Amino acid sequence: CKPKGAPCSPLMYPCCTGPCTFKENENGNTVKRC
C-alpha cells in the first residue's frame, strides 16, 4: 500500500491512509499524494 506522503494512483494504488488524495498533480499539486 501507499502511505501518506507517498504517490498513489486513483485506481491501481490503494493507500494505507484514507482516500488516495493529491495523486495527480493536475488536480492541484502532489502534496501528500496519498
Experimental method, per PDB record: NMR
Handedness of CA 3, 18, 10, 15 (dihedral sign): positive
Distance CA 26, CA 15 (A): 19
The three cell numbers of residue 34 are 496519498
Domain that holds residue 23: 1-34
How many domains would you assign to the chain? Answer: 1
Q: Which residues make Cβ contacts (< 8 Å) with residue 34, sequence separation at least 6? A: 2, 3, 4, 5, 6, 7, 8, 15, 16, 17, 20, 21, 22, 23
Q: How far is CA 21 from CA 12, 24, 33, in A?
A: 13, 8, 5
Closest CA to 17 of 6, 30, 31: 6
